[PDB]
Symmetry: D2
Subunit: 498 residues, 4 copies
């Protein structure tokens, strides 16, 4: 029996584990160290959570190693590993309300959204990748023959081994699912580091793996400090692969030392300043709706949020007038209340950064059309914001806010290449989008944008089957789609002469 | 008009460029600095070769970036890009004798083997990858539809940009062909760094690209210091990818900058200590012939050479007896002579290491059955060497020699797992092999060996279609086969709503 | 509410529909025509079953067509089509004991086998193919560009539309699953014609589709005469594809008017005479155990049964003697009894062919070592039979028995091509096997066998991931595996200029 | 030496083989039977051509079989098979002017166009598929393991055997290339039946296979009667696969004895009535240019020609007026005049059908805006023709003309589903087209069109890498692209237990 933090809310009784999950058991950190996790709706402490130490990281890795090398996970059929992942998906669905509620408490996710997306997308992700298990195939290859002898060459796809994955705070459960599911479907075992500010749905997910029958050690979770746990994973001889999503700083401060020692594969997702180019011949009202969703979705804590919007001169003023009208209707409130459209930011440090961000936008000469401030009310809410007359040299044309700030620049009519070049000046290349009814423009702009995802006449449309990952300083490597499996597999070539 | 070092040898006139190749032209290094290249058959200076300076690296990267972003390489059809590489393969084939002679001179390759492998396989590599250009395909993915609307999601495969490739010295032209052909087939442009000790086939190849009509800037070649050129390519913000093959010190102290920079895709091939396990039930004569080829091929300067042979106790002595008979028959001498079948080591420092390596073998107690020394003649020739009574803890059971040294251990009759455990004890995992007539043992052993390639009843059987690359400390990433394309492509996801 | 035939047997109460299943409902045939379905354990009538008429076929096709064109199956996401097929499989699992009992009554399947395989594999089939729905992908293709314009070319994989599938009698539910799960995963709708002698598990399966929420008209089931339903489905202009497994006779009447008017795709699995080659150096006791299975599994009613065993001269007498000891241990009895392991043949006409077949065997000179006759007991049991001295010109060396008749020929020691030539003399080429410890022999023989499946040191090891289908007169096209999907998809190429 | 028909023409001395090509030699038919081949520019006999007899077919088949089972083609490496096909493409390119002139003479292809496409694209076809040969791969499949044993499953891709292909007369060399390159790349051997009225480039092509070093018997060529050759090929027990393309009649008489014998795989391309839908928001002048091409290219002898143009109501009249301004500029005459735009029809009987087809369109009420007739001048020229006021029930809205007849109907402004339903009403489904600037209409229409190829804002843009084949009564199977290969390969599954 597991210790919980029990809590009655949203007409449920939550049972929330708060310890490290190592080797199939919930256990305290070395010397029972803990830290507090904070509810962004009111500022209150939700509970105390184990704060993993170096020696705990060693234990998790050992447990993952033993589970990979000698445990059942490495001995069962691919089809059966698939069943167990599809069973974990079902357990997650049986608990969806509870997970969406913990996500609402821990991360400030509006509850109706957390059920459909934070939780809804996680379940699709395990189900999708469970179905890959017995469909991962190698090749037989028609090589030149060592006459008068014959040759056969075949490749076997095999698991890489123990993986260390670091999860960001913006969709704690969903981002955990994205990495973990492909990694696990490929046959690996894993040590997961949830972001310090958001451990709780991760720890509940751990308990759910016990309910699903996932062997002890295949999943291990270490809440605590990022630099401490990330660094030790990066340096560990037994960890073969590091999946990192996070900030550039931050970040490859303690994870530069990864390929740079005992060798390991690395995947990296590091940020974006995604452009969204809206042409005059788009469907204006739709562009306002998708345009807003591109920025405000999930309180802007959205790794692919449109970071700049370029809006063609002749529709600019009308576009802004409409966005303002729609912004006025958004309902800011507690993520549990069903009428809420816009929830609190994830934690206080990040709220403070957004307030600074907008002070700076104003200072450097952008027009603040609305918001820009903390909402007067308890917790960490921030007012949906709109800036116009943004120029390419401004800090806010380059820095990623990671919050609900719409940053709008004009471009002249008929000026495709010029706006592409401005749209491409960012050192990032995670996502991008274009709204236009015109086929020729849509396809040309999608070739020319230097980003890993291009949305056309839509935005935020991710899918568990569609690979997602950046170019340039956004990193490299894909989550989601068949393409994600390859980061978590190695190829063995076997060549016979006979 | 190019400047050449002209030389009448091997029934032809060599015309060898000796300068840096940048932007389609051969040019002196900054300061006109040069260095000597040495012929290992007699110790003599073949010629002076330009020594790339930092600002030469910057010019090579600039020419590569401009060819990629604005040159014709980035505009022509994939199919036409295919034609250019098939033409280049043709021009290589037209100069096959010249190229193989340069290799014999510069690397000490036995000319008949250079003709069939060093050069023959290079020509096959560009022909193979030329056939991929118009068969690199993305996907259309059946994503969830935003009803009442529709979605279409597709991936585009695109080049990554400018690549920096660092070529080892054991098969100068071949290893260069192995990295460049996949990379150019994918639509990239490249800056190549041949080993300091063997620049000449690379520079002749640069010239051949002009005859083939590869646009300027697409290939640039920087002979010189590995640490100076390697570090500068590792830091250059315009280089997206570094492919490196070489040793882990090494070598890889320089190229260990690709983490904390602009962020680059990195591939690594770092060394091996490949085991070959020979069972009592094999064809013994064939095992002798193949076991020998696995150590002595290309005078042991072969990244996949069997670094350890494990031979079952009941056939051990007879195997060693038969190897000694075969080693006595080897003809050591000038690589250009048709009788020679064992050419010189590649350069003096490597010869020195082998002599020391064998001293250390003897001092720690292994039985030197034959060889062990410099052959007493001009140039850098080393005796084909055989050690027996090797024990798992001995230095020569763990260090990669890269020389023609056969390192033999016994294992008891009927051990299968015990021998597997020993064979896997190395930190490396590049290649491996098993000789046995027993289907069960073969299949089983090949599952169990932790190495990127497993040969069964053959050895050295590489093929341009068969992916090659290591596990563990040997690195990761593939050269050859369809799998190699993917290190040189990125995936762009494009999603519409309509 | 549904009309059932209720039966209390095997500690269950069975509830078995017996009417046509069309448009989501059980209905009588035109004129309320029926026929009887016979329990082959005792020869009794289990019950009357609707006997589909021509006008019924048109209705099933119209319901299938409407389901595909306008109903929900044509509209839901691929991922949700997957969910439905998984849920179908869960429902089948909940009903497993009952479906197995039905199969025991209707087909004589031994209960334990029917549970593990007839029904076990059916469930795996549905779950495997469920996983494929959202992983069926088309392509983007780098075609030549119409300069100064650009071009984008993509393929979309789309379903073919309404499919008629004709299921054999030997594993009614399994073969129904095989030939259907893929058709549905690809988003088609289906008219299924189960064998006249075994409608029952198909109809129960129809009920389960309702329980799983498969939309109406997606699955339609028409028990009845082979030649009436087959002939009308073949001629019906709205049926786009016939899947046919069955005898050539048989066969060439029914499904042989598919080219004749409207154009349809067809897949054909027509029978086999599969050779199993047993070499002196195999493992003898395993060869006997797997040779037994190759012939006697599922009372030889097994599309891939080894119909000729060639046993090497020096082990032949010993092998025959070990086979006879094993045959003597077989417990013949009622399929519901726990200790039975040889159950009755499927139906009476088939028992009659087996008796005629063994008479011709004896007529033509082969040695009957044992069996050959109907067992003296009610129902349709057949005594496990072993023939030796079989010569290549003999009828039993060429005609498939589909019954439990081991047909043994000798081959001379150390010949390999000579026996391969004998093993390939059959006009069929569905399956084949070879037992040998020698890797070179096993790889060589497997290249040289002209059969769609070659087993090596095993037999009857089919798997839902492994495609299965024959060559030569066995037909063409695959069930199982990713390759099965392609028979049930079409490709649409979309080419843009912009 | 080969016997030639020699002709001084187009600054060349053509040398034209004219016999059957069997076993790598040119030979008279049995009884020295011949027929004449007619030049459509003037109606004169080019030369007598051997007229294949039944025993000739058996000979070609036996030569193909022997080439496949015992000759070099079946023994060489895949990679070396590719080099032969590349070399064949080279020899074809060395003879391009001569191939084009033979096509201008035999088929009436305009010379400039024959160079660039009839011959141009043939060469690309061979080069494209040559690249496929060593890239055709099987799989290794993670099936369930028979614990405590292991299993390994792999598939081998293998040639099907002897193929018979029947080639249409509209693009004699090109269709031969499309239908044969893929068959050969996959390892097969072939008997080719060129259309009786166009044998000459096929036979010239056969001579080129000799110069390219294709082994004897791999390619055989039987000019003569379609019914006789097609039918004997359909019955032959040693032909595994028939590739047919031609009219449904025509057709079926012949190619429809493949089910009713010794089973064969068949691929069918049977005709088109492809719609082109031109919306009011397209670029109008472009639509005129592309719409004209869609009909008049290759004098409308084009299996994918647009047989109905649907033009939105508000642009209809201006589109027709612009079409008529362009038709008047078309230059009609000798295919060897370099300013010729429109050559003569391929043979007389097809010109007579074209005159009858136009009389039938006028009779049943359509408006003849221009053309409709034979151009008065020697040979078989027909005038480029435009019909308006075409209604859905008319003969010319349903029957494929195969001539230069533009067939125009209006569709109401802003309807989409209604124009789709009319465009889909044809029983054919080979190609289609939509011209529109609107991305949403383009995507939607491309989804809904029931056609194997949809062109968007272009037309006739086929490409050797893009699969080409129809739906519905147009047949099934693909030529071109990787998908073509699969029609010509079979899959062998090989499963081991160890």
């Amino acid at each position: 029996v597991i210790n919980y933090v029990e809590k009655a809310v949203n007409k449920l009784t939550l049972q929330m584990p708060y310890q490290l999950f190592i080797g199939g058991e919930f256990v305290d950190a070395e010397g029972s160290k803990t830290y507090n996790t904070i509810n962004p709706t009111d500022g209150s402490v939700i509970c105390q959570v184990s704060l993993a130490q170096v020696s705990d990281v060693d234990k998790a890795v050992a447990a993952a190693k033993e589970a990979f090398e000698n445990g059942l996970w490495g001995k069962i059929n691919a089809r059966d590993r698939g069943r167990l992942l599809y069973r974990l998906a079902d357990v997650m669905e049986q608990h969806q309300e509870e997970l969406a509620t913990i996500e609402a408490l821990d991360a400030g996710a509006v509850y109706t959204l957390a059920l459909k997306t934070h939780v809804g997308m996680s379940i699709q992700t395990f189900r999708y990748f469970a179905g890959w298990c017995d469909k991962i195939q190698g090749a037989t290859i028609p090589i030149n023959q060592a006459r008068p002898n014959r040759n056969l060459t075949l490749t076997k796809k095999e698991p890489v081994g123990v993986c260390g994955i670091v999860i960001p705070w913006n969709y704690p459960l969903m981002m955990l699912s994205w990495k973990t599911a492909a990694c696990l479907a490929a046959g690996n075992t894993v040590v997961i580091k949830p972001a310090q500010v958001t451990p709780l749905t991760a720890l509940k997910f751990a308990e759910l793996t016990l309910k699903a029958g996932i062997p002890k050690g295949v999943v291990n979770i270490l809440p605590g400090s990022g630099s401490l746990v990330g660094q030790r994973l990066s340096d560990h001889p037994d960890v073969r692969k590091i999946g990192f999503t996070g900030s550039t700083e931050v970040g490859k401060h303690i994870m530069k030392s990864c390929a740079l020692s005992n060798v390991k594969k690395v995947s990296l997702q590091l940020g974006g300043k995604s452009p969204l180019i809206i042409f005059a011949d788009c469907d204006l009202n739709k562009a306002v709706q998708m345009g807003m969703s591109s920025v405000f979705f999930n309180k802007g804590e959205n790794c692919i949020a449109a970071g700049r919007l370029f809006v063609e001169e002749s529709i600019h003023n009308q576009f802004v007038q409409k966005v303002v009208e729609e912004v006025e209707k958004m309902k800011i409130g507690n993520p549990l209340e069903r009428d809420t459209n816009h929830g609190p930011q994830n934690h206080e440090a990040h709220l403070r950064k957004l307030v600074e961000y907008c002070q700076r936008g104003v200072k450097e000469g952008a027009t603040l059309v609305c918001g820009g401030n903390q909402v007067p009310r308890p917790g960490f809410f921030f007012q949906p914001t709109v800036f116009t007359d943004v120029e390419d040299h401004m800090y806010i044309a380059k820095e990623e806010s990671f919050g609900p700030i719409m940053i709008i620049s004009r471009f002249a009519d008929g000026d495709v290449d010029a706006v592409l070049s401005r749209a491409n000046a960012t050192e990032f290349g995670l996502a991008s989008g274009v709204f236009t009814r015109d086929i020729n423009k849509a396809l040309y702009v999608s070739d020319k944008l230097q980003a890993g995802t291009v949305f056309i006449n839509t935005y935020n449309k991710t899918d568990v089957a569609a690979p997602f990952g950046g170019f340039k300083q956004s990193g490299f490597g894909k989550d989601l789609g068949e393409a994600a499996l390859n980061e978590y597999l190695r190829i063995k070539t076997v060549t016979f002469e006979y």
